[PDB]
Design a binder for this molecule. Structure first.
Ligand SMILES: Cc1cc2nc3c(=O)[nH]c(=O)nc-3n(C[C@H](O)[C@H](O)[C@H](O)COP(=O)(O)O)c2cc1C
Ligand SMILES: Cc1cc2nc3c(=O)[nH]c(=O)nc-3n(C[C@H](O)[C@H](O)[C@H](O)COP(=O)(O)O)c2cc1C
Lengths: 104, 104
């Protein structure tokens, strides 16, 4: 199943919701991740240029897809086919971001 | 502040998350709405044709915007400028629905 992360739009995009699949994939319970930026999923071999593209896309509220190296709670690396999109209201204001870890 | 509702994709789209603004707007606390279909917000003067258009859009996972009459927990009617979109993974599978009540 595909994991889903929802964050606030502003400040440092703290996580406000993760689905059940997220916990299966990552080994983290909601209470371990809520109120944190999702960058804690990254680790020593995560590609800097990929992180830079995510950073610029989120800052511009542009949808982006990247395959990024993440780490489970237990430290085991996994490939995250990650897609991030802004959630906008009808005035164009960004209300949230949604991230999907696609089950390929 | 715009309200946001996140539901599961399947079965009867149970609510899995609401933002703070949702509680301000509707008078319902998260624990009062989690696991329910959002149709409880409708009442006696809600337009049946508008409900039917939402029903068909969600069944087909099509984005839709409607101005729909909803009711606060205390019975106060309010106009909901509602936009619903599917959250898709990169295979096209629907992972969730997101609804926004646009603050006008
Ligand atoms: C909704 C959302 C979900 C995200 N999910 C992930 C994820 O699953 N894995 C990951 O490495 N980064 C994820 N990020 C990205 C990081 O939170 C952060 O934006 C990225 O590392 C670039 O910014 P930074 O250089 O400040 O860390 C997500 C971001 C958002 C807004
Ligand atoms: C994510 C999401 C948010 C929704 N938010 C609302 C809402 O704020 N108000 C409302 O009247 N209906 C909302 N709905 C619509 C109802 O849940 C339902 O789909 C609609 O009443 C039509 O289906 P029905 O004829 O089976 O009730 C939402 C649906 C989804 C998937």
């Amino acid at each position: 199943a595909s994991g889903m992360i929802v964050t606030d739009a502003g400040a440092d995009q703290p996580i406000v919701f993760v689905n059940r699949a997220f916990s299966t994939i990552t080994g983290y319970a909601p209470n371990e991740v809520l109120g944190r930026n999702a960058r804690f999923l990254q680790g020593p071999q995560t590609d800097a240029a990929t992180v830079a593209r995510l950073r610029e896309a989120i800052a511009a509220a542009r949808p982006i897809q990247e395959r990024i190296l993440n780490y489970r709670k237990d430290g085991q690396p996994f490939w995250n086919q990650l897609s991030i999109s802004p959630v906008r209201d009808e005035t164009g204001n960004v209300v949230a971001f949604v991230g999907v870890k696609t089950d390929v």
